[PDB]
Amino acid sequence: MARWDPGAEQRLKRAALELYSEHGYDNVTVTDIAERAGLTRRSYFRYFPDKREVLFGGSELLPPAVARAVLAADPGAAPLTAVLDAMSQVGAQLVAQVEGAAQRRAVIDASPELQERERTKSAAISRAVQDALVRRQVDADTAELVAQLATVAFGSAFRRWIDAEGHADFGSCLDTVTDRLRAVLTG
Amino acid sequence: MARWDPGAEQRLKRAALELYSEHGYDNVTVTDIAERAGLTRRSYFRYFPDKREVLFGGSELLPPAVARAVLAADPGAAPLTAVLDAMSQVGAQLVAQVEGAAQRRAVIDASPELQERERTKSAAISRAVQDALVRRQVDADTAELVAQLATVAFGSAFRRWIDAEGHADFGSCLDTVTDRLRAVLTG
């Protein structure tokens, strides 16, 4: 499907954002998305199973990937830095081009189903990170706090990154969020 | 329904935990829960709309209540302390008797639908806290981090509280989690 048309998925993801933006999430079907992308309804299902996954498909972090990146980190590094670095490395593409980032955010924030959809994803990533941390001799209770904290920090930084419309590097946004989190915890 | 039977809701909540424990969540109906509690199927719906809310009904934090407690706090207190204090004050009952706490946790952890159900609740509380914080002159971006951080800290502390089977006061669990979060952020 994409071997003879490598841009297929990208066109689908872009089409989705535009259609969800023009009309509303509830007013668009996978057929509309497929055709706007120059594909048939049947082809769509080779990439995504529903009209929801087209918003996450390749604009998310895969837990196994994040876990592996955490396992590969220098065991001497602080757990939080190791985790945030792993998330940034795995989401390098994501936090690279503000292109469509804001659109996607607007669509998700406007839909309760997509919001729950995102939380479920974040939980799975957090869980994968906990398991990797434990495999690295970090006690379970601590592993849980580090993963949850990282989830909060990365999510907030990403949001800030979107609001800066590209005028701020993801790194600075992350630095700002983590320094803020530290100030709140210490005062 | 409960005016002439004030223990009704409690018996329903207890019945639910026992039935969900004996059999499984997927194998119990509201009728089973109602009867085990000495009530009819019709009476159940006066308290909860489905077999899911009986697990949250009065064993959760209501966002409006938490928000109000945050608004009533001394404006001189650190935002995180104000929020955690508000959550503890509002959830005083919750973090009081380990009775059934572990059972409820086991049922929720075993069901993806209940888990999502809880996250949705946590998100709503976090959002209510953000709005209260903003009304107290805390900038939006900071308000978001404080609410999310508090959500993480309180949830983790509660879990630890459950695991201690009552041998630890919720306060210590919270102190331990927040000190741990601080150590991870500073090193």
CB within 8 Å of B137: residues ≥ 6 apart: B75
What distance in Å separates the CA atoms of residue B57 and residue B116, rounded to the nearest whole number? 16
A-facing residues of B in 142-171 (CB < 8 A) are 142, 144-146, 148-149, 152, 155-156, 159-160
Count of CA atoms in the C-beta half-sphere (13 A) of A10: 5
Secondary element (H or E) of residue B14: helix B8-22
- Please name the method used to determine this structure: X-ray
Residue A145, both tokens: 């706090």
What distance in Å separates the CA atoms of residue B86 and residue B136, rounded to the nearest whole number? 14
What distance in Å separates the CA atoms of residue B37 and residue B14, rounded to the nearest whole number? 8
Q: How far is B21 from chain A (nearest CA, A)?
A: 25
**C-alpha B160: how far from chain center:** 14
Contact between A177 and B145 using a beta-carbon 8 Å cutoff: yes
Dihedral angle sign, alpha carbons of residues A28, A30, A34, A35 = negative
Residue for token digits 């670095």? A85
Q: Which of A119, A109, A112, A100 is nearest to A19 (CA)?
A: A100
- The answer to whether the CB of A130 falls within 8 A of the CB of A144 is yes
* Data resolution in angstroms: 2.3
**DSSP secondary structure letter of residue B44:** H
- Within chain A, what is the greatest distance between any pair of CA atoms? 57
Segments of B26-158 assigned E as strands: none
Q: Which of B61, B65, B59 is nearest to B97 (CA)?
A: B59
CB atoms inside a 10 Å sphere around CB A100: 15
Residue/partner pairs of A96-101 with CB below 8 Å, 24 or more apart: A98/A161, A98/A162, A98/A165, A98/A166, A100/A13, A100/A14, A100/A17, A101/A161, A101/A162
What distance in Å separates the CA atoms of residue B133 and residue A43, rounded to the nearest whole number? 48
Count of CA atoms in the C-beta half-sphere (13 A) of A45: 4
Could you give the 3-state DSSP secondary structure of residue B176?
helix
CB burial of B118-130 (b: ≥16 within 10 Å; e: otherwise) equals bbeebbbbbebbb
In which region does residue A139 sit, left (phi positive, over 0), alpha (psi from -120 to 50) or beta (all else)? beta
Contact list in B for residue A142 (CB cut-off 8 A) is: 180, 184
What distance in Å separates the CA atoms of residue B15 and residue B168, rounded to the nearest whole number? 27
- Side chain identity at residue B112, one-letter code: P
What distance in Å separates the CA atoms of residue A70 and residue B187, rounded to the nearest whole number? 18
What distance in Å separates the CA atoms of residue B178 and residue A173, rounded to the nearest whole number? 23
CB atoms inside a 10 Å sphere around CB B82: 25
Residue B32, both tokens: 């089973």
- The answer to whether the CB of A25 falls within 8 A of the CB of A114 is yes
Contact list in A for residue B113 (CB cut-off 8 A) is: none
| Alpha-carbon dihedral B50, B55, B60, B64, rounded to 10 degrees | 0
In which region does residue B166 sit, left (phi positive, over 0), alpha (psi from -120 to 50) or beta (all else)? left
- Side chain identity at residue B110, one-letter code: A
Counts of helices then strands in chain B (DSSP H, E) = 9, 0
- The answer to whether the CB of A55 falls within 8 A of the CB of A118 is no
Q: Which of B159, B86, B95, B84 is nearest to A148 (CA)?
A: B159
Could you give the 3-state DSSP secondary structure of residue A3?
coil
The radius of gyration of chain B's CA atoms, rounded to the nearest angstrom, is: 18
Q: CA separation (Å) from B2 to A109, A124, B8, B12? A: 39, 40, 6, 11
**DSSP secondary structure letter of residue A5:** -
Q: CA separation (Å) from B87 to A37, B21, B90, B178? A: 49, 28, 5, 14
Q: Which of A116, A120, A186 sits opposite B182 (nearest CB)?
A: A186
- Side chain identity at residue A131, one-letter code: D
Contact between A80 and B185 using a beta-carbon 8 Å cutoff: yes
Segments of chain A assigned E as strands: none
Residue A176, both tokens: 């700002």
What distance in Å separates the CA atoms of residue B19 and residue B33, rounded to the nearest whole number? 7
- The answer to whether the CB of A151 falls within 8 A of the CB of B155 is no
3-state helix, strand, coil in chain A (%, to 5): 70, 0, 30
CB atoms inside a 10 Å sphere around CB A136: 14
Residue for token digits 């002159």? B137
Could you give the 3-state DSSP secondary structure of residue A91?
coil
- The answer to whether the CB of B9 falls within 8 A of the CB of B2 is yes
Contact between A184 and B152 using a beta-carbon 8 Å cutoff: no
- The ranges assigned to domains in chain A are 2-187
Which candidate in A156, A184, A186 is best for mutational testing of the B interface (most B CBs within 10 A)? A184
Which candidate in B149, B156, B162, B173 is best for mutational testing of the A interface (most A CBs within 10 A)? B149
- The answer to whether the CB of A32 falls within 8 A of the CB of A118 is no
What distance in Å separates the CA atoms of residue A7 and residue A9, rounded to the nearest whole number? 6
CB within 8 Å of A92: residues ≥ 6 apart: none
User: What would be the CATH architecture of the domain defined by A2-187?
Assistant: Orthogonal Bundle (1.10)
What distance in Å separates the CA atoms of residue A148 and residue A129, rounded to the nearest whole number? 9
- Side chain identity at residue A93, one-letter code: Q
What distance in Å separates the CA atoms of residue B78 and residue B81, rounded to the nearest whole number? 5
A123 contact B CB<8A = yes
**C-alpha B151: how far from chain center:** 10
Angle at B146 between CA B144 and CA B147, to 5 degrees: 65
- Provide DSSP, B86-112: HHHHHTTTTTT--TTHHHHHHHHHT-H
What distance in Å separates the CA atoms of residue B151 and residue B145, rounded to the nearest whole number? 10
